[PDB]
Amino acid sequence: AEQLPYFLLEPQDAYIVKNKPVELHCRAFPATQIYFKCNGEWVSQNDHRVREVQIEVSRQQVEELFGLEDYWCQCVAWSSSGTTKSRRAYIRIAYLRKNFDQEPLAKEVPLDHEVLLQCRPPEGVPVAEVEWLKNEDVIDPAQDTNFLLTIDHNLIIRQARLSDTANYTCVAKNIVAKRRSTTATVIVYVNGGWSSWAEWSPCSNRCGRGWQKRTRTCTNPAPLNGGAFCEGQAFQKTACTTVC
Numbered sequence: 001a002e003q004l005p006y007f008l009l010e011p012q013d014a015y016i017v018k019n020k021p022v023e024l025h026c027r028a029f030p031a032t033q034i035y036f037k038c039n040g041e042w043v044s045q046n047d048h049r050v051r052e053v054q055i056e057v058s059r060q061q062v063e064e065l066f067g068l069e070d071y072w073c074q075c076v077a078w079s080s081s082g083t084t085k086s087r088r089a090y091i092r093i094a095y096l097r098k099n100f101d102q103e104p105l106a107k108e109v110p111l112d113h114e115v116l117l118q119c120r121p122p123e124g125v126p127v128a129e130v131e132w133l134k135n136e137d138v139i140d141p142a143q144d145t146n147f148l149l150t151i152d153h154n155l156i157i158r159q160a161r162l163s164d165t166a167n168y169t170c171v172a173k174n175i176v177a178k179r180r181s182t183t184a185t186v187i188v189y190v191n192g193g194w195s196s197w198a199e200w201s202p203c204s205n206r207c208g209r210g211w212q213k214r215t216r217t218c219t220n221p222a223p224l225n226g227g228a229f230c231e232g233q234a235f236q237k238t239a240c241t242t243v244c
């Protein structure tokens, strides 16, 4: 009756990923015995001085537990004089649901428009870290300062450059898996603008009644990514009169 066991090593919290079991390890000294209690029941290594012990916990054990309360294991060590108890280690079922609640939709937009891409990722445990892809490459709001990630996992293109014409994809990840949304095509068009009217051609008669022409062109700018053609006359022709 001198001491009480000290845990050199304690069972650590852990996740069931798919149907793969979890090992818990614990080691203490000094100890005449050491053993796992899960949810108040003793459990031996079978289908479940310094001394150590290990166990496995299985998907089935965690599912079949009565109650909403997290499954837990702790170790108990024995000396000549008493017991010590390890921390409680929590084993949780990890998952990432298959379907996105909300995926982004394709858009046409004018140059300099604000674009909002909606994404509501599948639910996960652990909770799902959301990214966005621009033509594969991962966007990053720090560097790419024309982009904001909303706390709702949405993407904002602040004002649309023309290089922002791309395929955009919401990705959700955790330790279980990664899931890609439906890829949304964003297209940034420029509508056409007229040049200035060229100068009137000289009056076909230097003194008397004649005619002259002028023109302009859908080039200021030319339409782009299927923006609108210019609207109105490209060409004019009227009578003129110079006097002598």
Ligand SMILES: *[C@@H]1O[C@H](CO[C@@H]2O[C@@H](C)[C@@H](O)[C@@H](O)[C@@H]2O)[C@@H](O[C@@H]2O[C@H](CO)[C@@H](O)[C@H](O)[C@H]2NC(C)=O)[C@H](O)[C@H]1NC(C)=O
Pocket (backbone or CB within 6 Å): 135, 136, 165, 166, 167, 185, 186
């Ligand atoms: C958006 O989608 C299509 C297809 O996507 C990618 O193509 C490769 C570049 C590859 O890296 C994968 O990520 C995808 O498969 C893009 O590809 C071309 O364009 C047309 C679109 O009408 C497509 O249907 C053709 O198959 C593709 N042709 C060739 C020779 O690659 C498309 O360009 C993307 N849109 C934008 C705005 O970038």
Ligand SMILES: *[C@H]1O[C@H](CO)[C@@H](O)[C@H](O)[C@@H]1O
Pocket (backbone or CB within 6 Å): 192, 193, 194, 230, 231, 232
């Ligand atoms: C050319 O025509 C008129 C301007 O005169 C507008 O419809 C538009 O600016 C277009 O580029």
Ligand SMILES: *[C@H]1O[C@H](CO)[C@@H](O)[C@H](O)[C@@H]1O
Pocket (backbone or CB within 6 Å): 194, 195, 196, 197, 216
């Ligand atoms: C051509 O026509 C008149 C000027 O003559 C303006 O409306 C504008 O300059 C356009 O390019």
Ligand SMILES: [Cl-]
Pocket (backbone or CB within 6 Å): 005, 006, 007, 008, 084
């Ligand atoms: Cl201890």
Ligand SMILES: [Cl-]
Pocket (backbone or CB within 6 Å): 010, 011, 012, 013, 023, 024, 025, 026
């Ligand atoms: Cl452990």
Ligand SMILES: [Cl-]
Pocket (backbone or CB within 6 Å): 037, 039, 040
């Ligand atoms: Cl207990």
Ligand SMILES: [Cl-]
Pocket (backbone or CB within 6 Å): 042, 043, 044, 046, 048
């Ligand atoms: Cl047992």
Ligand SMILES: [Cl-]
Pocket (backbone or CB within 6 Å): 050, 051, 052, 053
């Ligand atoms: Cl041992």
Ligand SMILES: [Cl-]
Pocket (backbone or CB within 6 Å): 093, 094, 095
């Ligand atoms: Cl599951």
Ligand SMILES: [Cl-]
Pocket (backbone or CB within 6 Å): 096, 176, 177
């Ligand atoms: Cl899965």
Ligand SMILES: [Cl-]
Pocket (backbone or CB within 6 Å): 103, 104, 105, 116, 117, 118
């Ligand atoms: Cl959207």
Ligand SMILES: [Cl-]
Pocket (backbone or CB within 6 Å): 143, 144, 145, 146, 147
């Ligand atoms: Cl940017």
Ligand SMILES: [Cl-]
Pocket (backbone or CB within 6 Å): 161, 162, 163
């Ligand atoms: Cl641009």
Ligand SMILES: [Cl-]
Pocket (backbone or CB within 6 Å): 176, 177, 178, 179
């Ligand atoms: Cl995956």
Ligand SMILES: [Cl-]
Pocket (backbone or CB within 6 Å): 178, 179, 180, 181
């Ligand atoms: Cl997926």
Ligand SMILES: [Cl-]
Pocket (backbone or CB within 6 Å): 110, 111, 189, 190, 191, 227
């Ligand atoms: Cl435009």
